[PDB]
mmCIF file of C-alpha atoms in Angstrom:
data_model
loop_
_atom_site.group_PDB
_atom_site.id
_atom_site.type_symbol
_atom_site.label_atom_id
_atom_site.label_comp_id
_atom_site.label_asym_id
_atom_site.label_seq_id
_atom_site.Cartn_x
_atom_site.Cartn_y
_atom_site.Cartn_z
ATOM 1 C CA UNK A 1 -26.960 -76.257 -31.857
ATOM 2 C CA UNK A 2 -23.720 -78.097 -31.166
ATOM 3 C CA UNK A 3 -20.389 -76.720 -32.387
ATOM 4 C CA UNK A 4 -17.412 -78.582 -33.750
ATOM 5 C CA UNK A 5 -14.071 -77.739 -32.108
ATOM 6 C CA UNK A 6 -12.746 -75.569 -34.939
ATOM 7 C CA UNK A 7 -16.106 -73.959 -35.751
ATOM 8 C CA UNK A 8 -16.455 -72.653 -32.185
ATOM 9 C CA UNK A 9 -12.841 -71.495 -32.133
ATOM 10 C CA UNK A 10 -13.675 -69.360 -35.163
ATOM 11 C CA UNK A 11 -16.944 -68.025 -33.686
ATOM 12 C CA UNK A 12 -15.285 -67.043 -30.364
ATOM 13 C CA UNK A 13 -12.432 -65.335 -32.223
ATOM 14 C CA UNK A 14 -15.019 -63.396 -34.193
ATOM 15 C CA UNK A 15 -16.720 -62.530 -30.893
ATOM 16 C CA UNK A 16 -13.554 -61.000 -29.484
ATOM 17 C CA UNK A 17 -12.651 -63.720 -27.008
ATOM 18 C CA UNK A 18 -9.153 -64.431 -28.271
ATOM 19 C CA UNK A 19 -7.006 -62.770 -25.602
ATOM 20 C CA UNK A 20 -9.808 -61.049 -23.741
ATOM 21 C CA UNK A 21 -8.351 -59.909 -20.416
ATOM 22 C CA UNK A 22 -5.300 -62.155 -20.829
ATOM 23 C CA UNK A 23 -7.103 -65.417 -21.743
ATOM 24 C CA UNK A 24 -6.079 -66.945 -25.070
ATOM 25 C CA UNK A 25 -8.755 -68.504 -27.313
ATOM 26 C CA UNK A 26 -7.791 -72.065 -26.361
ATOM 27 C CA UNK A 27 -9.000 -71.406 -22.806
ATOM 28 C CA UNK A 28 -12.475 -70.395 -23.949
ATOM 29 C CA UNK A 29 -12.828 -73.355 -26.290
ATOM 30 C CA UNK A 30 -11.633 -75.754 -23.573
ATOM 31 C CA UNK A 31 -13.962 -74.124 -21.029
ATOM 32 C CA UNK A 32 -16.885 -74.584 -23.451
ATOM 33 C CA UNK A 33 -15.903 -78.208 -24.019
ATOM 34 C CA UNK A 34 -16.016 -79.284 -20.386
ATOM 35 C CA UNK A 35 -18.873 -77.039 -19.287
ATOM 36 C CA UNK A 36 -21.402 -77.855 -22.028
ATOM 37 C CA UNK A 37 -19.529 -79.995 -24.561
ATOM 38 C CA UNK A 38 -20.031 -77.294 -27.217
ATOM 39 C CA UNK A 39 -23.846 -77.300 -26.773
ATOM 40 C CA UNK A 40 -25.567 -73.909 -26.976
ATOM 41 C CA UNK A 41 -28.744 -75.605 -25.705
ATOM 42 C CA UNK A 42 -27.258 -77.315 -22.632
ATOM 43 C CA UNK A 43 -28.911 -76.639 -19.265
ATOM 44 C CA UNK A 44 -28.189 -78.164 -15.861
ATOM 45 C CA UNK A 45 -30.338 -77.853 -12.755
ATOM 46 C CA UNK A 46 -28.221 -77.323 -9.655
ATOM 47 C CA UNK A 47 -29.085 -78.754 -6.240
ATOM 48 C CA UNK A 48 -30.144 -75.387 -4.815
ATOM 49 C CA UNK A 49 -32.922 -74.739 -7.314
ATOM 50 C CA UNK A 50 -30.728 -72.642 -9.619
ATOM 51 C CA UNK A 51 -29.830 -73.616 -13.183
ATOM 52 C CA UNK A 52 -26.837 -73.258 -15.532
ATOM 53 C CA UNK A 53 -27.707 -72.190 -19.092
ATOM 54 C CA UNK A 54 -25.915 -72.335 -22.405
ATOM 55 C CA UNK A 55 -22.617 -73.213 -23.989
ATOM 56 C CA UNK A 56 -20.858 -71.810 -20.902
ATOM 57 C CA UNK A 57 -23.329 -73.036 -18.279
ATOM 58 C CA UNK A 58 -24.082 -69.635 -16.781
ATOM 59 C CA UNK A 59 -25.776 -69.861 -13.355
ATOM 60 C CA UNK A 60 -29.262 -68.377 -12.827
ATOM 61 C CA UNK A 61 -28.583 -67.425 -9.220
ATOM 62 C CA UNK A 62 -26.328 -64.460 -10.066
ATOM 63 C CA UNK A 63 -26.162 -63.844 -13.822
ATOM 64 C CA UNK A 64 -29.574 -64.146 -15.430
ATOM 65 C CA UNK A 65 -33.225 -64.448 -14.502
ATOM 66 C CA UNK A 66 -35.378 -67.512 -15.149
ATOM 67 C CA UNK A 67 -37.926 -66.552 -12.506
ATOM 68 C CA UNK A 68 -37.437 -69.929 -10.844
ATOM 69 C CA UNK A 69 -34.703 -68.918 -8.384
ATOM 70 C CA UNK A 70 -35.352 -67.597 -4.799
ATOM 71 C CA UNK A 71 -33.201 -64.609 -3.872
ATOM 72 C CA UNK A 72 -31.756 -64.548 -7.376
ATOM 73 C CA UNK A 73 -29.495 -61.832 -8.744
ATOM 74 C CA UNK A 74 -29.434 -60.844 -12.426
ATOM 75 C CA UNK A 75 -26.025 -59.217 -12.877
ATOM 76 C CA UNK A 76 -25.993 -59.729 -16.635
ATOM 77 C CA UNK A 77 -29.495 -58.259 -16.706
ATOM 78 C CA UNK A 78 -31.023 -60.797 -19.112
ATOM 79 C CA UNK A 79 -33.649 -63.549 -19.252
ATOM 80 C CA UNK A 80 -31.796 -66.853 -18.925
ATOM 81 C CA UNK A 81 -33.552 -67.840 -22.154
ATOM 82 C CA UNK A 82 -31.280 -65.483 -24.137
ATOM 83 C CA UNK A 83 -28.347 -67.765 -23.275
ATOM 84 C CA UNK A 84 -30.018 -70.672 -25.126
ATOM 85 C CA UNK A 85 -29.611 -69.934 -28.839
ATOM 86 C CA UNK A 86 -27.352 -70.985 -31.702
ATOM 87 C CA UNK A 87 -26.068 -67.397 -31.764
ATOM 88 C CA UNK A 88 -23.576 -67.087 -28.892
ATOM 89 C CA UNK A 89 -23.658 -63.259 -28.659
ATOM 90 C CA UNK A 90 -25.497 -63.047 -25.301
ATOM 91 C CA UNK A 91 -23.501 -65.937 -23.858
ATOM 92 C CA UNK A 92 -20.231 -64.231 -24.794
ATOM 93 C CA UNK A 93 -21.267 -60.794 -23.497
ATOM 94 C CA UNK A 94 -22.169 -62.238 -20.076
ATOM 95 C CA UNK A 95 -19.035 -64.394 -20.023
ATOM 96 C CA UNK A 96 -16.914 -61.274 -20.619
ATOM 97 C CA UNK A 97 -18.486 -59.522 -17.607
ATOM 98 C CA UNK A 98 -18.039 -62.658 -15.455
ATOM 99 C CA UNK A 99 -14.355 -63.097 -16.324
ATOM 100 C CA UNK A 100 -13.753 -59.362 -15.617
ATOM 101 C CA UNK A 101 -14.029 -60.173 -11.909
ATOM 102 C CA UNK A 102 -10.812 -60.809 -9.984
ATOM 103 C CA UNK A 103 -11.346 -64.574 -10.071
ATOM 104 C CA UNK A 104 -10.972 -64.679 -13.844
ATOM 105 C CA UNK A 105 -11.939 -67.978 -15.480
ATOM 106 C CA UNK A 106 -11.938 -69.674 -12.083
ATOM 107 C CA UNK A 107 -15.637 -68.780 -12.023
ATOM 108 C CA UNK A 108 -16.025 -71.938 -14.178
ATOM 109 C CA UNK A 109 -15.426 -75.098 -12.142
ATOM 110 C CA UNK A 110 -14.905 -77.184 -15.286
ATOM 111 C CA UNK A 111 -12.239 -74.791 -16.524
ATOM 112 C CA UNK A 112 -10.512 -74.954 -13.142
ATOM 113 C CA UNK A 113 -10.491 -78.784 -13.157
ATOM 114 C CA UNK A 114 -9.852 -79.605 -16.813
ATOM 115 C CA UNK A 115 -8.240 -76.618 -18.501
ATOM 116 C CA UNK A 116 -6.172 -74.531 -16.103
ATOM 117 C CA UNK A 117 -2.534 -75.599 -16.220
ATOM 118 C CA UNK A 118 -2.780 -77.600 -19.450
ATOM 119 C CA UNK A 119 -1.774 -77.120 -23.075
ATOM 120 C CA UNK A 120 -5.060 -75.303 -23.857
ATOM 121 C CA UNK A 121 -3.521 -74.166 -27.133
ATOM 122 C CA UNK A 122 -4.195 -77.725 -28.332
ATOM 123 C CA UNK A 123 -7.919 -77.007 -28.532
ATOM 124 C CA UNK A 124 -7.405 -74.555 -31.391
ATOM 125 C CA UNK A 125 -4.348 -76.162 -32.970
ATOM 126 C CA UNK A 126 -5.086 -77.588 -36.395
ATOM 127 C CA UNK A 127 -8.006 -75.298 -37.206
ATOM 128 C CA UNK A 128 -8.772 -72.821 -40.017
ATOM 129 C CA UNK A 129 -7.636 -75.024 -42.907
ATOM 130 C CA UNK B 1 -34.586 -47.969 -14.325
ATOM 131 C CA UNK B 2 -31.689 -47.149 -11.991
ATOM 132 C CA UNK B 3 -30.631 -43.819 -10.520
ATOM 133 C CA UNK B 4 -27.081 -42.852 -9.516
ATOM 134 C CA UNK B 5 -26.100 -39.747 -7.563
ATOM 135 C CA UNK B 6 -22.595 -38.436 -6.835
ATOM 136 C CA UNK B 7 -21.792 -36.454 -3.698
ATOM 137 C CA UNK B 8 -18.591 -34.942 -2.362
ATOM 138 C CA UNK B 9 -16.498 -31.733 -2.241
ATOM 139 C CA UNK B 10 -16.130 -29.081 -4.933
ATOM 140 C CA UNK B 11 -12.820 -27.587 -3.831
ATOM 141 C CA UNK B 12 -10.017 -28.942 -1.646
ATOM 142 C CA UNK B 13 -6.341 -28.447 -0.812
ATOM 143 C CA UNK B 14 -3.495 -30.594 -2.267
ATOM 144 C CA UNK B 15 -1.956 -33.559 -0.468
ATOM 145 C CA UNK B 16 -5.386 -34.244 1.040
ATOM 146 C CA UNK B 17 -7.709 -37.163 0.309
ATOM 147 C CA UNK B 18 -10.589 -36.847 -2.136
ATOM 148 C CA UNK B 19 -13.651 -38.792 -1.032
ATOM 149 C CA UNK B 20 -16.738 -39.374 -3.153
ATOM 150 C CA UNK B 21 -19.834 -41.507 -2.785
ATOM 151 C CA UNK B 22 -22.447 -42.645 -5.276
ATOM 152 C CA UNK B 23 -25.900 -43.487 -3.964
ATOM 153 C CA UNK B 24 -27.787 -46.076 -6.009
ATOM 154 C CA UNK B 25 -31.593 -46.104 -6.051
ATOM 155 C CA UNK B 26 -33.980 -48.451 -7.845
ATOM 156 C CA UNK B 27 -31.379 -51.214 -7.887
ATOM 157 C CA UNK B 28 -29.322 -53.158 -5.350
ATOM 158 C CA UNK B 29 -25.591 -52.546 -5.049
ATOM 159 C CA UNK B 30 -25.843 -56.350 -4.676
ATOM 160 C CA UNK B 31 -22.807 -58.117 -6.144
ATOM 161 C CA UNK B 32 -22.856 -55.954 -9.280
ATOM 162 C CA UNK B 33 -19.911 -54.129 -10.877
ATOM 163 C CA UNK B 34 -19.337 -50.423 -10.186
ATOM 164 C CA UNK B 35 -16.893 -48.008 -11.820
ATOM 165 C CA UNK B 36 -15.437 -44.500 -11.497
ATOM 166 C CA UNK B 37 -14.569 -42.344 -14.532
ATOM 167 C CA UNK B 38 -13.207 -38.808 -14.725
ATOM 168 C CA UNK B 39 -12.689 -36.115 -17.333
ATOM 169 C CA UNK B 40 -9.755 -33.708 -16.741
ATOM 170 C CA UNK B 41 -10.107 -30.074 -17.920
ATOM 171 C CA UNK B 42 -9.045 -29.972 -21.562
ATOM 172 C CA UNK B 43 -8.505 -33.751 -21.761
ATOM 173 C CA UNK B 44 -10.514 -36.861 -22.611
ATOM 174 C CA UNK B 45 -12.093 -39.542 -20.429
ATOM 175 C CA UNK B 46 -9.937 -41.554 -18.035
ATOM 176 C CA UNK B 47 -11.003 -44.779 -16.314
ATOM 177 C CA UNK B 48 -10.352 -44.706 -12.582
ATOM 178 C CA UNK B 49 -11.223 -48.306 -11.823
ATOM 179 C CA UNK B 50 -13.988 -50.591 -10.659
ATOM 180 C CA UNK B 51 -15.103 -53.187 -8.132
ATOM 181 C CA UNK B 52 -16.745 -56.518 -9.170
ATOM 182 C CA UNK B 53 -18.866 -59.320 -7.587
ATOM 183 C CA UNK B 54 -16.119 -60.988 -5.550
ATOM 184 C CA UNK B 55 -15.103 -57.629 -4.114
ATOM 185 C CA UNK B 56 -11.936 -57.601 -6.189
ATOM 186 C CA UNK B 57 -10.980 -54.127 -7.362
ATOM 187 C CA UNK B 58 -9.113 -52.930 -10.438
ATOM 188 C CA UNK B 59 -7.294 -49.558 -10.336
ATOM 189 C CA UNK B 60 -5.846 -47.566 -13.221
ATOM 190 C CA UNK B 61 -2.011 -47.770 -12.675
ATOM 191 C CA UNK B 62 -1.585 -44.174 -13.825
ATOM 192 C CA UNK B 63 -3.063 -43.184 -10.462
ATOM 193 C CA UNK B 64 0.034 -44.495 -8.662
ATOM 194 C CA UNK B 65 -1.906 -46.626 -6.120
ATOM 195 C CA UNK B 66 -3.658 -43.612 -4.540
ATOM 196 C CA UNK B 67 -7.148 -44.940 -5.231
ATOM 197 C CA UNK B 68 -9.413 -47.184 -3.175
ATOM 198 C CA UNK B 69 -12.906 -48.300 -4.207
ATOM 199 C CA UNK B 70 -15.390 -49.936 -1.838
ATOM 200 C CA UNK B 71 -19.006 -51.116 -1.689
ATOM 201 C CA UNK B 72 -21.410 -50.259 1.176
ATOM 202 C CA UNK B 73 -24.106 -52.951 0.976
ATOM 203 C CA UNK B 74 -25.809 -51.669 4.135
ATOM 204 C CA UNK B 75 -26.514 -48.177 2.768
ATOM 205 C CA UNK B 76 -26.596 -49.364 -0.876
ATOM 206 C CA UNK B 77 -23.784 -47.126 -2.148
ATOM 207 C CA UNK B 78 -20.162 -47.304 -3.329
ATOM 208 C CA UNK B 79 -17.222 -44.934 -2.882
ATOM 209 C CA UNK B 80 -13.997 -43.511 -4.230
ATOM 210 C CA UNK B 81 -10.961 -42.410 -2.231
ATOM 211 C CA UNK B 82 -8.010 -40.678 -3.887
ATOM 212 C CA UNK B 83 -5.004 -39.820 -1.714
ATOM 213 C CA UNK B 84 -2.465 -37.021 -2.151
ATOM 214 C CA UNK B 85 -4.382 -34.931 -4.664
ATOM 215 C CA UNK B 86 -2.755 -32.179 -6.730
ATOM 216 C CA UNK B 87 -3.844 -29.761 -9.455
ATOM 217 C CA UNK B 88 -3.664 -32.715 -11.866
ATOM 218 C CA UNK B 89 -6.658 -34.478 -10.275
ATOM 219 C CA UNK B 90 -9.021 -31.611 -11.112
ATOM 220 C CA UNK B 91 -11.915 -32.967 -13.150
ATOM 221 C CA UNK B 92 -15.561 -33.986 -13.324
ATOM 222 C CA UNK B 93 -15.942 -37.380 -11.674
ATOM 223 C CA UNK B 94 -18.658 -39.781 -12.799
ATOM 224 C CA UNK B 95 -19.915 -42.972 -11.208
ATOM 225 C CA UNK B 96 -21.474 -45.680 -13.348
ATOM 226 C CA UNK B 97 -22.488 -49.311 -13.600
ATOM 227 C CA UNK B 98 -19.624 -51.240 -15.248
ATOM 228 C CA UNK B 99 -21.789 -52.157 -18.248
ATOM 229 C CA UNK B 100 -21.794 -48.450 -19.104
ATOM 230 C CA UNK B 101 -25.594 -48.349 -19.114
ATOM 231 C CA UNK B 102 -26.164 -46.137 -16.042
ATOM 232 C CA UNK B 103 -24.302 -42.960 -15.033
ATOM 233 C CA UNK B 104 -24.339 -40.302 -12.329
ATOM 234 C CA UNK B 105 -24.866 -36.580 -12.965
ATOM 235 C CA UNK B 106 -21.143 -36.155 -12.540
ATOM 236 C CA UNK B 107 -19.479 -33.936 -9.974
ATOM 237 C CA UNK B 108 -16.822 -31.283 -10.453
ATOM 238 C CA UNK B 109 -13.877 -31.450 -8.081
ATOM 239 C CA UNK B 110 -11.309 -28.678 -8.124
ATOM 240 C CA UNK B 111 -7.926 -28.967 -6.424
ATOM 241 C CA UNK B 112 -7.107 -25.247 -6.622
ATOM 242 C CA UNK B 113 -3.296 -25.136 -6.572
ATOM 243 C CA UNK C 1 -1.551 -49.731 -21.612
ATOM 244 C CA UNK C 2 -3.447 -49.939 -24.878
ATOM 245 C CA UNK C 3 -3.468 -46.584 -26.624
ATOM 246 C CA UNK C 4 -6.621 -45.579 -28.490
ATOM 247 C CA UNK C 5 -6.252 -43.043 -31.315
ATOM 248 C CA UNK C 6 -9.399 -41.220 -32.466
ATOM 249 C CA UNK C 7 -9.394 -39.359 -35.806
ATOM 250 C CA UNK C 8 -9.943 -36.543 -36.348
ATOM 251 C CA UNK C 9 -9.847 -34.387 -33.205
ATOM 252 C CA UNK C 10 -12.559 -32.090 -34.544
ATOM 253 C CA UNK C 11 -14.802 -33.303 -37.347
ATOM 254 C CA UNK C 12 -16.716 -30.487 -39.008
ATOM 255 C CA UNK C 13 -19.882 -31.430 -40.889
ATOM 256 C CA UNK C 14 -23.149 -29.932 -42.147
ATOM 257 C CA UNK C 15 -26.589 -31.155 -40.979
ATOM 258 C CA UNK C 16 -27.914 -34.134 -42.912
ATOM 259 C CA UNK C 17 -24.502 -35.252 -44.186
ATOM 260 C CA UNK C 18 -22.764 -38.514 -43.279
ATOM 261 C CA UNK C 19 -19.967 -38.617 -40.725
ATOM 262 C CA UNK C 20 -17.296 -41.251 -40.112
ATOM 263 C CA UNK C 21 -15.200 -41.262 -36.959
ATOM 264 C CA UNK C 22 -12.178 -43.546 -36.827
ATOM 265 C CA UNK C 23 -10.687 -45.262 -33.792
ATOM 266 C CA UNK C 24 -7.462 -47.261 -33.901
ATOM 267 C CA UNK C 25 -5.949 -49.403 -31.172
ATOM 268 C CA UNK C 26 -2.243 -49.934 -30.524
ATOM 269 C CA UNK C 27 -3.090 -53.592 -29.742
ATOM 270 C CA UNK C 28 -5.603 -56.034 -31.285
ATOM 271 C CA UNK C 29 -8.767 -55.796 -29.204
ATOM 272 C CA UNK C 30 -11.137 -58.193 -30.941
ATOM 273 C CA UNK C 31 -14.566 -56.522 -30.855
ATOM 274 C CA UNK C 32 -14.037 -55.025 -27.392
ATOM 275 C CA UNK C 33 -14.564 -51.443 -28.454
ATOM 276 C CA UNK C 34 -17.479 -49.253 -27.281
ATOM 277 C CA UNK C 35 -18.564 -45.797 -28.402
ATOM 278 C CA UNK C 36 -19.787 -43.006 -26.160
ATOM 279 C CA UNK C 37 -21.506 -39.698 -26.863
ATOM 280 C CA UNK C 38 -21.128 -36.786 -24.445
ATOM 281 C CA UNK C 39 -23.199 -33.631 -24.960
ATOM 282 C CA UNK C 40 -22.243 -30.499 -22.963
ATOM 283 C CA UNK C 41 -23.091 -30.566 -19.256
ATOM 284 C CA UNK C 42 -24.269 -34.184 -19.484
ATOM 285 C CA UNK C 43 -22.693 -37.538 -18.629
ATOM 286 C CA UNK C 44 -21.466 -39.776 -21.464
ATOM 287 C CA UNK C 45 -24.077 -42.018 -23.096
ATOM 288 C CA UNK C 46 -23.345 -45.467 -24.529
ATOM 289 C CA UNK C 47 -24.223 -45.654 -28.259
ATOM 290 C CA UNK C 48 -22.596 -48.798 -29.617
ATOM 291 C CA UNK C 49 -21.057 -51.664 -27.663
ATOM 292 C CA UNK C 50 -18.724 -54.436 -28.784
ATOM 293 C CA UNK C 51 -17.926 -52.593 -32.032
ATOM 294 C CA UNK C 52 -21.264 -53.126 -33.778
ATOM 295 C CA UNK C 53 -23.953 -54.173 -31.288
ATOM 296 C CA UNK C 54 -26.754 -51.613 -31.377
ATOM 297 C CA UNK C 55 -28.671 -50.308 -28.354
ATOM 298 C CA UNK C 56 -32.452 -49.889 -28.184
ATOM 299 C CA UNK C 57 -33.311 -46.216 -27.779
ATOM 300 C CA UNK C 58 -30.476 -45.038 -30.024
ATOM 301 C CA UNK C 59 -31.127 -43.464 -33.464
ATOM 302 C CA UNK C 60 -30.768 -45.896 -36.365
ATOM 303 C CA UNK C 61 -28.366 -43.444 -38.010
ATOM 304 C CA UNK C 62 -25.624 -44.603 -35.587
ATOM 305 C CA UNK C 63 -23.648 -47.756 -36.452
ATOM 306 C CA UNK C 64 -20.163 -49.067 -35.888
ATOM 307 C CA UNK C 65 -17.971 -51.653 -37.513
ATOM 308 C CA UNK C 66 -14.456 -53.003 -37.521
ATOM 309 C CA UNK C 67 -12.290 -55.390 -35.533
ATOM 310 C CA UNK C 68 -8.701 -55.966 -34.494
ATOM 311 C CA UNK C 69 -7.255 -52.453 -34.387
ATOM 312 C CA UNK C 70 -9.474 -50.624 -36.879
ATOM 313 C CA UNK C 71 -12.929 -49.350 -35.926
ATOM 314 C CA UNK C 72 -15.433 -46.932 -37.408
ATOM 315 C CA UNK C 73 -18.496 -45.095 -36.175
ATOM 316 C CA UNK C 74 -20.754 -43.966 -39.000
ATOM 317 C CA UNK C 75 -23.478 -41.336 -38.602
ATOM 318 C CA UNK C 76 -25.874 -41.326 -41.562
ATOM 319 C CA UNK C 77 -27.805 -38.050 -41.373
ATOM 320 C CA UNK C 78 -26.057 -35.767 -38.923
ATOM 321 C CA UNK C 79 -28.739 -33.915 -36.949
ATOM 322 C CA UNK C 80 -28.697 -31.011 -34.483
ATOM 323 C CA UNK C 81 -28.782 -33.339 -31.470
ATOM 324 C CA UNK C 82 -25.889 -35.410 -32.844
ATOM 325 C CA UNK C 83 -23.457 -32.563 -32.294
ATOM 326 C CA UNK C 84 -21.249 -33.503 -29.339
ATOM 327 C CA UNK C 85 -17.989 -35.264 -28.406
ATOM 328 C CA UNK C 86 -17.583 -38.982 -29.152
ATOM 329 C CA UNK C 87 -15.265 -41.419 -27.387
ATOM 330 C CA UNK C 88 -14.241 -44.997 -28.123
ATOM 331 C CA UNK C 89 -13.220 -47.232 -25.224
ATOM 332 C CA UNK C 90 -11.567 -50.642 -25.170
ATOM 333 C CA UNK C 91 -12.373 -53.253 -22.525
ATOM 334 C CA UNK C 92 -10.028 -55.920 -23.854
ATOM 335 C CA UNK C 93 -7.281 -55.144 -21.351
ATOM 336 C CA UNK C 94 -6.894 -53.466 -17.984
ATOM 337 C CA UNK C 95 -6.531 -50.604 -17.597
ATOM 338 C CA UNK C 96 -9.514 -49.708 -19.757
ATOM 339 C CA UNK C 97 -8.637 -46.755 -21.970
ATOM 340 C CA UNK C 98 -10.506 -44.069 -23.914
ATOM 341 C CA UNK C 99 -9.466 -42.337 -27.110
ATOM 342 C CA UNK C 100 -8.814 -38.589 -26.973
ATOM 343 C CA UNK C 101 -12.328 -37.963 -28.230
ATOM 344 C CA UNK C 102 -13.789 -36.576 -31.443
ATOM 345 C CA UNK C 103 -15.726 -33.321 -31.284
ATOM 346 C CA UNK C 104 -18.369 -33.371 -34.032
ATOM 347 C CA UNK C 105 -19.414 -29.794 -34.771
ATOM 348 C CA UNK C 106 -21.573 -28.046 -37.380
ATOM 349 C CA UNK C 107 -20.139 -26.759 -40.664
#
């Protein structure tokens, strides 16, 4: 499934992301845009054998298990497959844990390069009617 | 399947430092998140703080910067250090994985004063 | 910090009856509210996370709902093993905070 800008804004708000740990909704929508382009099915194989899964490209080396990664950690304690569904619940739950680290949303390279320091509020402006 | 076990003192004088450790078996202290919670006598639950993957630590401000939390990857355990204790810090301390899924037996610490 | 208000302090109910615990937050916390159950002598146990997400191994009679600042934990058929103290906790902002707790006892 691929979300529209406003549709995802609404789903993330409903999933308690708006202002979670100091990050307004526009940050999460922007992060999703540049990480997976709103695709819940997106997956990218990294150069070290690990793979990013889901709408927020969550890495299999430290957050989930796909059984295809060497000395892999599974901090979110889930099969990487659970991050690939039209229902973002698992993706959001793991993203909340991830952003609870001291690094915040810096964990996401795309967010650091395309969202941080910009008018992220623009991503949700003009939604809900 | 993860087992947590608190260890420390039961009684100690004020102005001293309270030190607790939580040994984790069946799982690796790896780069996971660990927390400390306590329940004061006749009060509810209070969150002490936690340490995450990067090593960054978050401490409840109400504890006036007296707390320190660290991870011992060699001996697979994490700790809690509370300076300048007083009667107010008397409680049952619990260690737990940040996700709230796993908890220790809990240990009673009394600062008789 | 965000203040969590649990109501009532002591809920008295008879076995088999339904029970509703309320938790309010002084700030909007999305769905970042979790419920804990603590029986005497034991450590707290997670029952419901993120306001309504159920946990495998937990009786079906436990369910939560709500969002923003209003949350509710409903217990269908109160049983003997359901008698204990219940706490709500928000993870929306640091420091994380717990409500004062709600002691569910037999009537």
